[PDB]
Design a protein around this ligand. Structure first.
Ligand SMILES: Nc1ncnc2c1ncn2[C@@H]1O[C@H](COP(=O)(O)O)[C@@H](O)[C@H]1O
Ligand SMILES: Nc1ncnc2c1ncn2[C@@H]1O[C@H](COP(=O)(O)O)[C@@H](O)[C@H]1O
Lengths: 375, 376
């Protein structure tokens, strides 16, 4: 079986052609700077991905393509399992776009162009929420008016579920220990950033909320913030609710506080003596330390902590700084291991660390491909 | 001996005490409740009623060496945090800030206003919930939002319940006969409002409430922590005004909104009767509390002591048990017998094997206010 995988984000479109059984990748790539002269919209972007495949000597028509898998961030209550795309599903994803305004809209546009180019294949949506569907009620229920919550279906959905799931599975395998025997924390530190607590393979907590706005500090998102700040910006700073949301999603996190377009730039700013960048980094780490401790308490016993996604996989100082000074919680980083140049699943804790600490790279494309099978 | 009158004016109640700060002796104490209608329509009427109770109990303030009247003020923003003699400037600032602490700043201002009419010739002193947290480290008090917008509008984590967090951290050190500066501590103020703090060698390094008392733990009627996306959704889709969302989060949330219980005693009674909603609310409350305890253990790195205080913290053994159960891996073990035995004294509730020492350390809030008035 062969699958085309599309992850259509606001600014870029990631694609791969994958054989899920073997895991082999026949091609992968990223079309960047959507809105450029060359790639002005998502429709241009998928067409360009097709040109790159062709340029590589890959012709989809000769491949056994059985499905096209898409990342969708929010499906609300109705859609969370891998689902065959139809007009119904697209209508619901559109309805829910305001719950995930940075992700659902370009995902839908990715679907729209893909269904035009490949109208006779099944298109399958794979949802970020799926892994968290069975979160325990005490972890997913906000402490608000119960009638109100249930009336509007307010609960913690959680996101990055395919990464948290994949990484928790792969950490067990790396340790050659049964998934069901392990209590784990997974730290998905990318443009979006989320933590999960996984107890014997089952998600028991995660940091994002009804929407991807809750939790860790992110690239442009605030994460956790006092609800009073929102009320004050509305009441006293005179900002509209939409403008406050926009600020929290797009002019917050490392960018808003630190001035950095992405995490590589931030670390460069810090290296150049920029105090604002250093504060934004320290705020990011302080938040991350708090989620790690919080989730150790949720689990009771913690066997494994794994770092993943762009920052988690590639920035040793984040991993060091997140875990520094936690000998009394059973955690000790091996600095030589942590600093190793490597892209492989790997150990970063010392032999005497009671908690095992890993880097376990995410593979969204493989996860989506496998989730298409059988649907 | 020097005597202080303490006024602690909340949304629907006014707590009063006449206290000797040196000995800690209370000459009188009481609470006026159900303020807002009937015989006690407002806080002016409430303090007058307090004075009637003092007289009925045989207390005559004019016979006392009353040196000051102390008032709890929750928010003074940037300008007022130290214990401060009340003047019009301070009142005007507290009034300006009232929407940041709508359950607390307005009734406290009203209490000052009547107190100054009844006792014009005494200094009235404001004691602020934020003081203990004034010097929080910037990485703990700076929200990850647009830096320039935050700076312009003075947005940062202030923290509240400071007098209790301060008092308990001091008293935990004294109880353990160890220097205050040697200890890393967590304090859990579990009352109608609820907040946690992390204290390193006497200095606060983190706390759970925010710019406002709305952030952090689950509380009596307050939500504490919530996805900002929920607020946006309630506005956009449920058609609620921002003021009404705020009111819901402050007044119809927490154990009440979720559990249908007017207070924690009632909540436990419902649970014992088999009320599934009340049980889920308790489990949400404990889940959140556990997360803050774990979080602040990571902030401190090494934690020497965890102390419970305030109404629930002092009086509800199951909360202390459930908040800390299954944490042997983090060096914590509760002694169930010590935890269950009734006492009103500062006391140990952890086993000798527990690496982290666990205490119950009661706070008398009125006593703390009276003490802060001395030497202002
Ligand atoms: N080698 C690297 N060094 C620093 N940051 C990186 C590196 N690789 C990826 N990132 C960051 O990870 C984020 C993207 O992660 P993701 O969303 O998982 O693709 C961006 O902020 C990138 O700058
Ligand atoms: N003995 C008790 N048993 C259960 N809850 C109590 C007890 N005493 C006080 N509380 C609760 O503590 C909360 C108020 O604490 P505070 O704000 O410190 O007065 C209320 O929910 C009370 O019902």
């Amino acid at each position: 079986v062969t699958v085309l995988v599309v992850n259509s984000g606001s600014s870029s479109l990631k694609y791969a052609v994958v054989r899920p059984a073997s895991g082999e990748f026949l091609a992968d790539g990223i079309i960047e700077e959507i809105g450029s002269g060359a790639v002005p919209d998502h429709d241009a972007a998928l067409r360009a991905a097709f040109d790159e495949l062709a340029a590589a000597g890959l012709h989809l028509e000769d491949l056994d393509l059985k499905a096209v898998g898409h990342r969708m961030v929010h499906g609300g209550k109705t859609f969370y399992k891998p689902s065959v795309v139809d007009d119904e599903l697209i209508a619901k994803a559109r309805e829910l776009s305001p719950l995930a305004p940075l992700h659902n809209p370009p995902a839908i546009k990715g679907i729209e162009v893909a269904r035009k180019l490949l109208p006779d294949l099944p298109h399958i949506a794979v949802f970020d929420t799926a892994f968290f569907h069975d979160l325990p009620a005490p972890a997913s229920t906000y402490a608000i008016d119960r009638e109100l919550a249930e009336t509007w279906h307010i609960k913690r959905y959680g996101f990055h579920g395919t990464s948290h799931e994949y990484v928790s599975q792969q950490a067990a395998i790396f340790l050659d220990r049964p998934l069901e025997s392990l209590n784990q924390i997974v730290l998905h530190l990318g443009n979006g950033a989320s933590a999960s607590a996984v107890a014997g393979g089952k998600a028991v907590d995660t940091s994002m909320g009804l929407t991807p706005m809750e939790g860790l500090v992110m690239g442009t998102r605030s994460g956790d913030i006092d609800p009073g700040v929102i009320m004050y910006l509305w009441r006293t700073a005179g900002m509209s609710v939409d403008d406050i949301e926009s600020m929290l999603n797009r002019r917050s996190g490392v960018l808003g506080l630190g001035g950095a377009s992405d995490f590589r730039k931030l670390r460069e700013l810090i290296e150049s003596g920029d105090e604002h960048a250093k504060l934004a980094y320290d705020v990011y780490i302080h938040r991350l330390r708090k989620y790690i401790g919080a989730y150790m308490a949720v689990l009771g016993r913690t066997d494994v902590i794994s770092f993943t996604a762009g920052v988690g996989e590639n920035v040793p100082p984040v991993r060091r700084d997140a875990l520094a000074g936690l000998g009394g919680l059973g955690i000790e980083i091996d600095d030589a291991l942590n600093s190793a140049k490597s892209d492989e699943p790997r150990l970063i804790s010392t032999p005497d660390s009671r908690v095992t600490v890993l880097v376990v790279p995410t593979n969204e494309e493989l996860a989506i491909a496998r989730a298409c099978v059988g649907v």
